[PDB]
């Protein structure tokens, strides 16, 4: 499967004039575009090699569309202050995300369009692309406006149609970097916490895409209780890293197995300690 | 490519 996602952050800055507007675009786990109201360019900018192949018509349209979004979010910050009876002295955050998923055949699976205000759910298009989830009474006001204007029809045309066409275009032109799996290079480290117990840490490095499952077993039952699992983190080269740790009774390091699952792995992997 | 939606909250 594949995805295209755009992430928008609008932040009010009481003393410092115009709000901050950041836009990022991803195909799967690969960033391809950015816009930042505070950068010199005032242009949508490339962040992947493949998108630089697009000509001036593409960049002019995307720059126009992104600056149009920022103007809409400028007014949205003001409206939400009205809805929640907030003054201009506080900094507030609007977040917006939209995109589409496609299967292996590149046919539409589902669409997304959702907003948050100060880190809470505000309004989302439901999975059926026809109706809205309003998180609170402020979002109910938005919902009634959007129902009255038949907003869902035009948004659905993008999510099922245009969004899918852009993703297919990018998947073909960016195929080298987008239609790839980098298998995790796995390894293990050992750290004595005490004289009676040690830490076993199961490493997966240099993998793409980010989706991965690290599992620890002690005699074939998953240690769902006792495993610490760090957040998957970017290496900064277009790959990801992750680790999972268990504290084991020292000299019973043999008795624990780490299982790694990833799209790039023909066979799920399995590690044990080597001293 | 970005959505061209004009709708305000």
């Amino acid at each position, epitope marked *: 499967s594949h995805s295209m996602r755009y992430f928008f952050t609008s932040v009010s800055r009481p003393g410092r004039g115009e709000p901050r507007f950041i836009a990022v675009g991803y195909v799967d786990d690969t960033q391809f575009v950015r816009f930042d109201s505070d950068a010199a360019s005032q242009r949508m900018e490339p962040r992947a090699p493949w998108i630089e192949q697009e000509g001036p018509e593409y960049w002019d349209g995307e720059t126009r569309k992104v600056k*149009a979004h920022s103007q809409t979010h400028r007014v949205d910050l003001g409206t939400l202050r009205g809805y929640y009876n907030q003054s201009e002295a506080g900094s507030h955050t609007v977040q917006r995300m939209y995109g589409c998923d496609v299967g292996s055949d590149w046919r539409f699976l589902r669409g997304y369009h959702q907003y948050a205000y100060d880190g809470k759910d505000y309004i989302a298009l439901k999975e059926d692309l026809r109706s809205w989830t309003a998180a609170d009474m402020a979002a109910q006001t938005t919902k009634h*406006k959007w129902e009255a*204007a038949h907003v869902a029809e035009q948004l659905r*045309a993008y999510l099922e149609g245009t969004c899918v066409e852009w993703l297919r275009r990018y998947l073909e032109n960016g195929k080298e970097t987008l239609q790839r799996t980098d298998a995790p290079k796995t390894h293990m480290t050992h750290h004595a916490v005490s004289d009676h117990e040690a830490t076993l840490r199961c490493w997966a490095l240099s993998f793409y895409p980010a989706e991965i499952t690290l599992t620890w077993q002690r005699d074939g039952e998953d240690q769902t209780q006792d495993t610490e699992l760090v957040e998957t983190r970017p290496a900064g080269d277009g790959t990801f890293q992750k680790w999972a740790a268990v504290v084991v009774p020292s000299g019973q390091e043999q008795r624990y197995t780490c299982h790694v699952q990833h799209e790039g792995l023909p066979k799920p992997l399995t590690l044990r300690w080597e001293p | 490519g970005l959505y*061209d939606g004009m709708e305000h909250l």
Partner: T-cell receptor
Amino acid sequence: KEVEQNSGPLSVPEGAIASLNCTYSDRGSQSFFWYRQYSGKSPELIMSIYSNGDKEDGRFTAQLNKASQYVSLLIRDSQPSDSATYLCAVRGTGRRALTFGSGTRLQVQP
Amino acid sequence: MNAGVTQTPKFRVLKTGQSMTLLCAQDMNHDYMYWYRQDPGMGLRLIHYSVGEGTTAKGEVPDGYNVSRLKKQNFLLGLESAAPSQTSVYFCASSFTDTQYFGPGTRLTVLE
């Protein structure tokens, strides 16, 4: 040349189909509208369309062909009261205003 | 919708050099408002538009015209110094998204 319609008049007998045709330059355009304007009155919305294919509303059908950058309004069972100028409107990429064609005069002959 | 957009005046004759303001009003809490002129063979030409209160932008034929949107419900078109070339039918429109609803129009004739 951004939105092109033939001026007409397109002359059609009552009961027959009328196809009002429209082409547009900006391939990224996401919205398409048909307006009716009677002499000395204001444009009235007939149809909006967004996706490739058909959309029906009473005797009206709009059809959008984004590949050929071509959009049509079909008036089925045309009546003399359908006689008017039909205006095609397109919103280009990242635009916050509509671009109107110069319109097609339709006369439905009783 | 069309009925929600009001426009005054309906008709005006002006002497070259005279001033006037056309008033567009909508009670639909529409974010977007538009001033067009319509001339035979030209169709509708955008003069100026507005994406919100306190913001305006040039259309296709802005020169000779100014606008104000100090209040969300009203979009004012000002003719500073009427010229014969401004003899036209003026339509205002409003939209929540891109679907525009038009006012009933203003017929202006400018005479020497």
